[PDB]
């Protein structure tokens, strides 16, 4: 529209005034460059920054001005073809044409083209294309755009020519490496590269991004979630959650089991604090527990306001009995079981995090057949997520 | 630094220390021509070079069509018709301070507002 | 000035020496390693202010667990040197001193450099060894870095058990060079298998086994 | 490009003979202490001597170059800062024709050398083919168009459109152009569309199209089906 | 830097002033040689003030030089500590004088116990090039950067805490590691070779993995941990770093045909 | 906005002094003597031949059937006279060399006793150089002294 | 002064059929002259017609 075209003209005009002001301050020797660069480098960074800022702002205005009846907006919102840069260069402004990441250098004596003056540092003469593809381009801009196009073609050609050589070196570099029938990655000569493929023994076709609930959350949320007290009123158990809640309260054995589970989760939280120091809880792991829980709730018709028939020993002893069923190595010696525990520690921490008494009795409200079905599905999918021996 | 040449020989005059009268001299090792010293200076390196920025200034610099034109007046003759160009010394750390060249008295006055 | 800075570098290097010897399996208490700088200067520095490295030479005794695991492990004798360039006569006094005191291993720390004749006069008394370390190289312990996992020196029975359970020859294991500052830190020899415990981001605790060249 | 040609080479002897008649001092008589401000003369890279008046000499060589005496394929450059005057008459140089702009006119400002009467006679001869024998050579011998290579292009100021950058001073559908602050326009472009080659000339509105598509079309234009000849 | 001295600019300025290479030529505007036969008395009328102060058999030839005060500021220096450096460089064969910081013109003069000029000119080269005023070798352009660091809060979740981190041009890992004022337990190098040499094979492994992973994440692509781990391990299973070349697996037995 | 292709119909529908004479010396003296020029290279302004002292002396110091290359005339006559002359006494030395390029057009206006002048065309021109001022040399001694 | 640029198109010379056939015809003409003289030397040396 008209007003949008005027807003783009003023947007570019303000950037032109900024480049003229920084240009006058640079010619007056009133601007000191920062550490690491010189005056010309900082000046070019300021000019290029202002021009790209004006081009991006004009592209945003041209994007907002368009309605939903346009087809290019439907193709951009569809995610098939088109982007924001395309409509930003066609509807608003092309932008700054740069060669080798720098402005248009002087191919002549102190000037880019023989059609401008010497010692000209104006953005228009240095490669800025203020026109758009809708109204055509000027010759001094079409020439620089042709330089950028040829540079793009040459760069792509070199990247492909080197990409092929890299591909051959990688293929012929990693070829005679496989996994034998012992879950140990070793080449044809018997040299062991990795004692366990991927340091976990899982194929790259059954891993999904999972969230670790042990480190996530504050300390008040951690103690608010993983503490189910029976003899104390700080984190007591709501008796309306389960049918026998009136008999679970006051039990010392189940409270001791809750103490062991809570201490185990705390040790897992310290371990995760030592392993991942960045603070991220999302990591790729096998077996999706959320889909199993949702399939159990939608399968057994598990809704809200429904007392569960589970207890503390069923969930605690159920998880403890499921942790022993996870097997990747079929050995029975010391080193084999040590590698199995060290290769299953993280997954056991995830299962102990997602399979808490409060999380099942409070939120999930799972029953006996639903919980056992979840255990069988977790063990099953864990037995299907194992990498097959003999894969290249 | 701005050394002289010998007479007839025209060779450079190497410095010779005068131990008798304890004074500097200039000699020619080809012949026996030794003249006195008018200055104790001999050598000057001058690391940071600032000259050459205003190189190539000719009497016919005002007839160059490729050069631009400005409207700033000269501090001497007060002529608004002049031709400006940056430093001729080509280097990475060379500043972009303009050099104004008046088209009347041929004076070279710069545009630096910090140091003049 | 430079004297206090050299005392500080010698103190951090000496602490690194105590940590290195403690990691080898010798009995050095925690309070002996965590000795402050003011006490070290109040012990091994004269009234003028210059430190005395001849008094810093001490003896290391293996722990009970190290003897129980390695019955052939003996005591250690740690010496330094006040000379900037270690001569051959000082090295002769070190070797003869080790032969008199009957130590299984030895550690000699130099300041700048040692003559090549002394370095040649090192494998003279089998099966005893001598570890020559630089004072400027032991300023910082490399095992306290984040990119350096944990290393444990195995025994012969555990090596044969590893090669028997994994069905491997000694050449099929990942090899580690003797020139490794880690191998020099632990003082490894030819045919010794070490275990590397590293904290992976896909299993939490990954173990590896290497063997020296 | 569509108006680009290759030089063929002439004879530098008449020029060297003509320079010494106006006081061109030979090189062997040169003394830098007696003539420091002398301008060096170069003919095909050979330093024959200097001259203490490059203004009148350059004006003479240019006036005689526009009249048709000297072959227009010869490109002469006068580097002021370098204080040199290169003369290239060797074969192999690529040049292109451009108009000549004159500042001294009866209107009070700058204007092209070619007028409307020359265009009228030219079109009269073109549509007549009674005739007036007014062709491109007649336009060249009268000093109205000149060839320029890439060496002389360093010392000239070219204007794009004639009736847009020469006179001195808007619908939002037209493209934004530059200004006319520059006064010393020595030459003017015949037409910008001539910078493209043969294959790119078939492209309709290549300004509104990105360059790599112009390249791909310029590559597909060399293999399309058609009629090459009639025989 | 250290967690105790974090978010501090002056401390980072001290560390930068402790490792960044500096030379005598950096501060030198110009130098000039004079013939002044009398050792004590100087013909130059200005420097007489210096002659009056810095005084209260030797060469008749004088070497003199002038420094940039701005260089004395940007690179923190003292005319005193400079003269100290030269005196402890050439020892006693070259007598030395230097002007005060108060002097609006920084002056340094030196003499010695055929012509003396050539000897002085040799000493000039030694002065400019072979004198390093401060900082360890192969370190330039130390850039202060505010990097946010995720560190655990005592409230149970991580918090971004900006700290000053020193980016560095050039490389010298061993020397930089020993300097006091930084964490010797934390330091990285873009050249994994140095990490291999100094910190050993395991550090070389992890560093290699970081280098590969970097290019992948820079391209804006995701690759599973398994593949990169396998690749890195293969390059390190024979000890050290092994090239991926035709000189990196065709120089070790695998069968003549392979 | 369209290509105007109907221009054929539009163009078809639109169209005190002192005078002294000069003389040429008879060619007999030109056949007897050849006039050459002298130019010194010692920077000293004066240097006349009277100060050059006496006695001034200027003197010049089996196969079957095969193939020859060729050569021309004036270049051969100038190539065979490869012995430069020298002027000395019995000491100052001046050795001249050819100039060649300064031939072209050079006319001499020798002034006689009367105001008239005698014009003589210049044959050649030579540059004399004052040789052996310092008096030193070495050859092999300098070849071995330059190896230090 | 900056380093002399070699990518300046004015410092480049093109070669069409003229220069190419000049080099070619030059070398071929030299070979022709050499062969003719060879026949001359053979004729005068072997003493024939
Ligand atoms: Zn002389
Ligand atoms: Zn003026």
From Swiss-Prot, chain B:
Protein family (similarity comment): Belongs to the archaeal RpoM/eukaryotic RPA12/RPB9/RPC11 RNA polymerase family.
GO terms under cellular component: nucleolus; nucleus; RNA polymerase II, core complex
GO biological process: maintenance of transcriptional fidelity during transcription elongation by RNA polymerase II; RNA-templated transcription; transcription by RNA polymerase II; transcription elongation by RNA polymerase II; transcription initiation at RNA polymerase II promoter; transcription-coupled nucleotide-excision repair
Designated name of the protein: DNA-directed RNA polymerase II subunit RPB9
First and last residues of each zinc finger (C4-type): 6-31
Main location: nucleus
Subunit structure: Component of the RNA polymerase II (Pol II) complex consisting of 12 subunits.
Keyword terms: DNA damage, DNA repair, DNA-directed RNA polymerase, Metal-binding, Nucleus, Phosphoprotein, Transcription, Zinc, Zinc-finger
Source organism: Saccharomyces cerevisiae (strain ATCC 204508 / S288c) (Baker's yeast)
Compartment annotation: Nucleus, Nucleolus
SUPFAM superfamilies (UniProt xref): Zinc beta-ribbon
From Swiss-Prot, chain C:
GO cellular component, one term: RNA polymerase II, core complex
Entry GO MF terms: DNA binding; DNA-directed RNA polymerase activity
Domain of life: Eukaryota
Keywords: DNA-binding, DNA-directed RNA polymerase, Nucleus, Ribosome biogenesis, Transcription
PROSITE patterns per record: RNA_POL_H_23KD
Any one of the GO BP annotations: transcription by RNA polymerase II
Cellular localization per UniProt: Nucleus
Record carries keyword DNA-binding: yes
Family from the record: Belongs to the archaeal Rpo5/eukaryotic RPB5 RNA polymerase subunit family.
Function, in words: DNA-dependent RNA polymerases catalyze the transcription of DNA into RNA using the four ribonucleoside triphosphates as substrates. Common component of RNA polymerases I, II and III which synthesize ribosomal RNA precursors, mRNA precursors and many functional non-coding RNAs, and small RNAs, such as 5S rRNA and tRNAs, respectively. Pol II is the central component of the basal RNA polymerase II transcription machinery. RNA polymerase complexes are composed of mobile elements that move relative to each other.
Listed name of the protein: DNA-directed RNA polymerases I, II, and III subunit RPABC1
From Swiss-Prot, chain D:
Subunit structure: Component of the RNA polymerase II (Pol II) complex consisting of 12 subunits.
Lineage: Eukaryota, Fungi, Dikarya, Ascomycota, Saccharomycotina
Secretion signal span: none
Organism superkingdom: Eukaryota
Species this chain originates from: Saccharomyces cerevisiae (strain ATCC 204508 / S288c)
Designated name of the protein: DNA-directed RNA polymerase II subunit RPB2
Record's function text: DNA-dependent RNA polymerase catalyzes the transcription of DNA into RNA using the four ribonucleoside triphosphates as substrates. Second largest component of RNA polymerases II which synthesizes mRNA precursors and many functional non-coding RNAs. Proposed to contribute to the polymerase catalytic activity and forms the polymerase active center together with the largest subunit. Pol II is the central component of the basal RNA polymerase II transcription machinery.
Cellular localisation: Nucleus
Family according to the record: Belongs to the RNA polymerase beta chain family.
Additional record remark: The binding of ribonucleoside triphosphate to the RNA polymerase II transcribing complex probably involves a two-step mechanism. The initial binding seems to occur at the entry (E) site and involves a magnesium ion coordinated by three conserved aspartate residues of the two largest RNA Pol II subunits. Present with 18700 molecules/cell in log phase SD medium.
From Swiss-Prot, chain F:
Origin: domain of life: Eukaryota
Subcellular location: Nucleus
Transmembrane stretches, start-end: none
Post-translational events: Phosphorylated on Ser and other residues by TAF1 and casein kinase II-like kinases.
Subunit composition and interactions: TFIIF is composed of three different subunits: TFG1/RAP74, TFG2/RAP30 and TAF14.
Family recorded in the similarity comment: Belongs to the TFIIF alpha subunit family.
Biological role: TFIIF is a general transcription initiation factor that binds to RNA polymerase II. Its functions include the recruitment of RNA polymerase II to the promoter bound DNA-TBP-TFIIB complex, decreasing the affinity of RNA polymerase II for non-specific DNA, allowing for the subsequent recruitment of TFIIE and TFIIH, and facilitating RNA polymerase II elongation.
Other comments on record: Present with 1920 molecules/cell in log phase SD medium.
Record's protein name: Transcription initiation factor IIF subunit alpha
Species per Swiss-Prot/TrEMBL record: Saccharomyces cerevisiae (strain ATCC 204508 / S288c) (Baker's yeast)
Classification of source organism: Eukaryota, Fungi, Dikarya, Ascomycota, Saccharomycotina
